[PDB]
């Protein structure tokens, strides 16, 4: 996350670090005790899902870990146009909810007017960094027509974007499949945008939750 | 011709270790790849990276 | 804090999860979707 | 009647 800043503490129960050997991949989202929501093209075998995690570099005796059973990418995902950017972990066993790993409600109605929304994760930050401490940024939804005028020919109704243009906070590698969270929903997910990071010019570009709400439904209850 | 490619990125906000062919160092070096996108100056392993380069 | 919690909504006609902050606010307010639905469900 | 009530993250949010 670029031109962000450290989260509060108690601000991010519902954020995931997904894991491979031992390195952060990407983001996610507990959306369901067992079910964490991330981008399909974080898709990797053998991920590690933890929760309750604010400072990758310390052992945090809130955390939680856990190998992913079943992993569902969406069957209509398109990996060359990022559409339909969006998969399913589940848990081995549900999470222990505490004030610190915490489920987000989903954006249910494509049509909410929240615009304030903000981005977090532990992705590469402005210096080129990776931080051990989860980044926070404020940034705003953009509108459909100004997001196809920025990105010609390649959004979908499945995607959102959002940015900032007095800092361009946006989200940078690390950050994949984590929330876009608007009026305490899950908005979106952390899917792609301008190559370098950072959303002066460009905003960044989000997995569009609220189209995915039955698809999430039927394979929870699967 | 793809060795010599720099490494890139791509516009996804992932974060997979990929190997890519540094001229400048003839060897086959770490990058960080977003998950989509890119060159073909791109490889799972060290090994394949150089056994292509 | 953000705790996940259970309201009935009208437009939707049956329980739906909001971020409840603690403490205050007013009791439609459900720690699960059963228990909100036998309270408001019909 | 309870149930017609907006949702309310109430003062500690």
Wanted: with cysteine; net charge negative.
């Amino acid at each position: 996350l670029v031109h962000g800043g450290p989260c509060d503490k108690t601000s991010h129960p519902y954020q995931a670090a997904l894991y491979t050997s031992g390195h952060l991949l990407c983001g996610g989202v507990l959306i369901h005790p067992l079910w964490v929501l991330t981008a399909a093209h974080c898709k990797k075998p053998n991920l590690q899902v933890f929760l309750g995690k604010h400072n990758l570099g310390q052992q945090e005796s809130s955390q939680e870990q856990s190998s992913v059973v079943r992993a569902v990418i969406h069957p209509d995902y398109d990996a060359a146009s990022h559409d339909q950017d969006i998969m399913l972990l589940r848990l081995a066993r549900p999470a222990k909810l505490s004030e610190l790993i915490q489920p987000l409600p989903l954006e249910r109605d494509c049509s909410a007017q929240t615009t304030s929304c903000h981005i977090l994760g532990w992705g590469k930050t402005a210096d080129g960094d990776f931080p051990d401490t989860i980044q926070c940024a404020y940034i705003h939804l953009v509108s459909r027509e100004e997001c196809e005028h920025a990105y010609p020919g390649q959004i979908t109704q499945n995607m959102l974007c959002a940015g900032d243009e007095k800092y361009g906070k946006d989200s940078c590698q690390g950050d994949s499949g984590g929330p876009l969270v608007c009026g305490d929903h899950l908005r979106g997910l952390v899917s792609w945008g301008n190559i370098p990071c950072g959303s002066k010019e460009k905003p960044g570009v989000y997995t569009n939750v609220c189209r995915y709400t039955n698809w999430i439904q039927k394979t929870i209850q699967a | 011709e793809v060795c010599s490619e720099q490494a890139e990125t791509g516009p996804c906000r992932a974060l997979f270790f990929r190997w890519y062919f540094d001229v400048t160092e003839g060897k086959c070096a770490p990058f960080v790849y977003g998950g989509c996108g890119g060159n073909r100056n791109n490889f799972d392993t060290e090994e394949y990276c150089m056994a292509v380069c | 804090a953000l705790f996940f919690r259970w309201y009935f909504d009208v437009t939707e006609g049956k329980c739906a999860p909001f971020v409840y902050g603690g403490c205050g606010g007013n009791r439609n307010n459900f720690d699960t979707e059963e228990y909100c639905m036998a309270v408001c469900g019909s | 009647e309870v149930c017609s009530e907006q949702a309310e993250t109430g003062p500690c949010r």
